[PDB]
Design a protein around this ligand. Structure first.
Ligand code: 57G
Length: 125
């Protein structure tokens, strides 16, 4: 079955607003979210519904853009790099579970390319 989704709130962690964090939500995440190939990445992989029973045997650090969006909205991240790492994990997981030429892999490649173009103009710390 599925694990619970990743935590999107931490009550023992302080919160701050930064130029970088605002950009990550309003520019980076927003732009990826609206991409034609965003849909497989907008929520946790539902392995039960999709009948992918080995998915969470193979992927022990799942991540998705729905989670990332909620983390940003909830001020879950203190440092911008925490958010960037989550995107990286999300992409890397595809390359672990799937094979070259799989639809999902081509979709990940397009999103990652876009992600890098957007992170390029990330405001300074
Ligand atoms: C191909 C499986 C997969 C998805 C995915 O989500 N595929 C998906 C979702 C649904 S759906 O019913 O849940 N659905 C309604 C359309 C989405 C809102 C239906 C069919 C699907 O192929 N994502 C990732 C990262 C993977 C990986 O294999 C990654 O290693």
């Amino acid at each position: 079955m599925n694990p619970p989704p990743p935590e999107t709130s931490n009550p023992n962690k302080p919160k701050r607003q930064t130029n970088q964090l605002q950009y990550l939500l309003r520019v980076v995440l927003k732009t990826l979210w609206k991409h034609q190939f965003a849909w497989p990445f907008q929520q946790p992989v539902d392995a039960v519904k999709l009948n992918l029973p080995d998915y969470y045997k193979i992927i022990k650090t799942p991540m998705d853009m729905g989670t990332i969006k909620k983390r940003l909205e909830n001020n879950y991240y203190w440092n911008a790099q925490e958010c960037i790492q989550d995107f990286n994990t999300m992409f890397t997981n595809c390359y672990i579970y799937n094979k070259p030429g799989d639809d999902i892999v081509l979709m990940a490649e397009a999103l990652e390319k876009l992600f890098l173009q957007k992170i390029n103009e990330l405001p300074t710390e």
